[PDB]
């Protein structure tokens, strides 16, 4: 019983970087997605694999909230079957994803004069990420034929890069907060249902 605690995920003071995206398990509560939709003015609210009309009537074993911060024009990469730096090295969704992606502009919170360098993203990687994979490795990336031996030289790049979010920029470069809800339905008592 009792409403699902979405507050600590969406209203949270701090959000993680895209390469270290945060995950939260939600269960044993009733989810009212109309209240969540009308709780604020979101920029994107798109549900994949499930009809939004039939949302307050379903039941699932669990739900998982993945929260992070990206830039505007990268929001297109948070979707099944998308490519790009974020969709390959930071956060990956399966082709058969079932859930809902929500995103909203956060320039008033994640933009500082001179840029915000606290937010990073992975730039180089040897292989793509599997769906729902989280990589926090900081090993030196080998670019050339010479071995790196964990020394920051040339052809030996650090795999993470700063965003530098700045307020006066256009909305394409402005920081956006992204929360992805994934629905898990197993042979188990469904602990999340509509009203």
């Amino acid at each position, epitope marked *: 019983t009792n409403l699902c605690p979405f507050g600590e995920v969406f209203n949270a003071t701090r959000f993680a970087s895209v390469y270290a995206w945060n995950r939260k398990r939600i269960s044993n509560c009733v989810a009212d997605y109309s209240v969540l939709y009308n709780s604020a003015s979101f920029s994107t609210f798109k549900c994949y694999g499930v009809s939004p009309t039939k949302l307050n009537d379903l039941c699932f074993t669990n739900v998982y909230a993945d929260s992070f911060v990206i830039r505007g024009d990268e929001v297109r990469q948070i979707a099944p079957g998308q490519t790009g730096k974020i969709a390959d090295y930071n956060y990956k969704l399966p082709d058969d994803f079932t859930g809902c992606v929500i995103a909203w502009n956060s320039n008033n919170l994640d933009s500082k004069v001179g840029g915000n360098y606290n937010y990073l993203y992975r730039l180089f990687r040897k292989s793509n990420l599997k769906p729902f994979e989280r990589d926090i490795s900081t090993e030196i990336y080998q670019a050339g034929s010479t071995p790196c031996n964990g020394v920051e030289g040339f052809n030996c790049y650090f795999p993470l890069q700063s965003y530098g979010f700045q307020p006066t920029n*256009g909305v394409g470069y402005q920081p956006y907060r992204v929360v992805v809800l994934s629905f898990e339905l197993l042979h188990a008592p469904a602990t999340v249902c509509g009203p």
Partner: antibody
Amino acid sequence: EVQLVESGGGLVQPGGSLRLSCSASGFRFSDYWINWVRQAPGKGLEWVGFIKTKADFGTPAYAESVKGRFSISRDDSKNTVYLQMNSLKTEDTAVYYCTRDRGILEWLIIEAGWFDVWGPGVLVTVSS
Amino acid sequence: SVLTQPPSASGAPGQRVTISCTGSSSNIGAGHYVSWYQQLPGTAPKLLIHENDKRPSGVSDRFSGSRSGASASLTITGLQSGDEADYYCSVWDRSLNTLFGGGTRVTVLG
């Protein structure tokens, strides 16, 4: 030839009702947001309303001058967006245009978007 | 909020004409990419500029767009007698949704 065509206009009495239909031709009609924009005779362009797609959580949003009187719906099986007008006033006499929203398709954020395809327009005259 | 546009913009044949669109900090001062559309006498509007800078294919390259602070500028180089039309600018706002400008009537001075 990608097309959008509106139909169902003409002369209506003050207080009457009328339904305009906008039909598409040559593209994925279920993937685009649809906007209705009107223009009074000899005046500027005024946004009337918009409707999202099936997989988008939300309801159509209207203008404050027509909120509670105009309704926007869609039928994907027939590729037609319907604009229903009830309790019509003489202020509603205008040319109505049906358009689609690209940029929302590519960037998926409300802050970025533009209209690329426009229909010829349909005249609605409210007089007695 | 109806973004303010000059009622007209004139120029001798071959000039460089500029049209300005002024908005609030809620729409043009917050990025919110601006769009520029053209309406010939008796026709439907046609998209000219999107994302304040980009030209769709087929649109002539004599049309340029820029954004500064809470204002936008559309520049037409090499003015032609065929460019005489009405021009509108459209932006999204957090409260009032889509807004259009007052319209600028371009005249080639004879």
